[PDB]
Structures are given as structure tokens and as C-alpha cells.
């Protein structure tokens, strides 16, 4: 019960791949995505985006063992990036960084096949 299953280890690897990805300048693109702005700070976010997601929530689902496979986790990452790209303009850094991380996620999944 203290030993992680292979699926649990794979989930953790994918999550850390996204979280730890660094660009050529050593920036971790995940930083903005770890925790959403609060409902008090950014109400127009929550009136627009119906299914809010951040990496804190993904990590929480992962620790409660709510992900029974890798695609379930990928789906929540992709919802997060889709939301970021819906709320923020295409010229924005957050939009751009979401595209890159979505690519990093898909590469990671493919490499762990
Ligand atoms: O879009 C996200 C963040 C957007 N910001 C722009 C507006 C703003 C005001 N204060 N802080 C911010 C951050 C986001 C973050 C985490 C996960 C998913 C997201 O869509």
C-alpha cells in the first residue's frame, strides 16, 4: 500500500514532465498553470470558463487515485490548456506557453507507450 503501482508511477512521470519542462532560457512554462487566480480576483474567468482546471487540482486527483489511466489525466491537462487558450488572447504569453506544454504532454505520452 506504500508501493506505487506501475500506472501510478507512469501518471507521476507524465505530471512531472509537464511541470518540469524548461525552455532554452531555463523558464518553467508550468508556473502560471499551477494555481488559477481566485474567484474573487478574476470573476470574468469563472463566468466564461465552465470547467476550471489547474495543476493543483490535477495533482489532487492523482493523489486521491482518481486517475485509473493515463488518458484520464491527459484529458484534464488538455482541458486546462484549452481553457487558457480560450480565456487569453493568441498574442499572450500564457496562450503561447499553453500550446508548447500541450505539445510536451503529447510527446511525453507517445514516448511512454
Ligand atoms: O488563464 C490562466 C491564467 C490567466 N491569467 C491572466 C489574468 C490574470 C489575473 N491575475 N492572474 C492572471 C493569470 C490559467 C491559469 C492556470 C490554469 C489555467 C488557466 O487558464
CB of residue 55 inside a 6 A radius of ligand 1: no
Q: Which atom of ligand 1 is nearest to the CA of 80?
A: 18
Q: Name the phi and psi angles at 106, rounded to 5.
A: -65, -40
Nine cell digits for residue 35: 494555481
How were these coordinates obtained?
A: X-ray
Alpha helices in the chain (DSSP H): 6-20, 43-48, 55-63, 70-87, 93-111
Which residues, in sequence order, are CB contacts of 101 under 8 Å at separation 6+? 18, 21, 29, 30, 33, 77, 81
Q: Assess whether the C-beta atom of 79 lies below 6 angstroms from ligand 1.
A: no
Q: How far is the CA of 1 from the centre of ligand 1 (A)?
A: 37
- Cα separation of 61 and 54, whole Å? 11
- Give CA torsion, residues 62, 86, 38, 25, to 10 deg: 70
Resolution value, angstrom units: 1.8
Please name the residue whose Cα sits nearest to atom 2 of ligand 1.
84
State if residue 11 touches ligand 1 by the CB under 6 angstroms criterion. no
Q: Whose CA is nearest to atom 20 of ligand 1?
A: 84
CATH 3.20.20.80 assigned to domain 1-113? The reply is no
Amino acid at each position: 500500500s506504500k508501493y506505487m503501482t506501475p500506472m501510478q508511477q507512469k501518471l507521476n512521470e507524465v505530471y512531472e514532465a509537464v511541470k518540469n519542462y524548461t525552455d532554452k532560457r531555463g523558464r518553467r512554462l508550468s508556473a502560471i498553470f499551477l494555481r488559477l487566480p481566485s474567484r474573487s480576483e478574476l470573476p470574468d474567468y469563472y463566468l466564461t470558463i465552465k470547467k476550471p482546471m489547474d495543476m493543483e487540482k490535477i495533482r489532487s486527483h492523482m493523489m486521491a487515485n482518481k486517475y485509473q489511466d493515463i488518458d484520464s489525466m491527459v484529458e484534464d491537462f488538455v482541458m486546462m490548456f484549452n481553457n487558457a487558450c480560450t480565456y487569453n488572447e493568441p498574442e499572450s504569453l500564457i496562450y503561447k506557453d499553453a500550446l508548447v506544454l500541450h505539445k510536451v504532454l503529447l510527446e511525453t505520452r507517445r514516448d511512454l507507450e
